[PDB]
Amino acid sequence: QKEMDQLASEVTRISTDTEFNTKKLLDGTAQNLTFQIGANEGQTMSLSINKMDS
Amino acid sequence: IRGLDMASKNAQDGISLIQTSEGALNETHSILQRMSELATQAANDTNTDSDRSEL
Amino acid sequence: KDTKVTKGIDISSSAKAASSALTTIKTAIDTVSSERAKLGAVQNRLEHTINNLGT
16 A cells, blocks of 8 residues: 555646646646647637546 | 819829728738637637637 | 827737737738729829820
């Protein structure tokens, strides 16, 4: 169980520490990420990464 | 004759007045063109508000 | 007193706002192109008026 709690505490670290730019990706806050792939309005793509912690 | 040769100066003094205006709008086009790149970059959601306000 | 400041269209409040500004900017390019050739049309006419006045 000592390694059980240490592995499960590292899964949580990756979720709260993984950060592109200043955005936490895997903590459930990166939702509705809109990429403007196109030169006009509405030429976007959405994306939602779920919370992936222990 | 002295009217048409003088009215030809007026026509050319209007050509200069018009070249100046469209010469100026030649740059409002470039500014508006650059101003449109700073809205396709600001629309991407990899930017943060610290960087949208930076744009 | 009477100091003017100009503030650009909103692109920093959100990604939706920046996309909204895209049509506003691309329309402004359209109403500048309209003005430029409203002045290029007059200049073309004035070039014909000069040859006819000279003749």
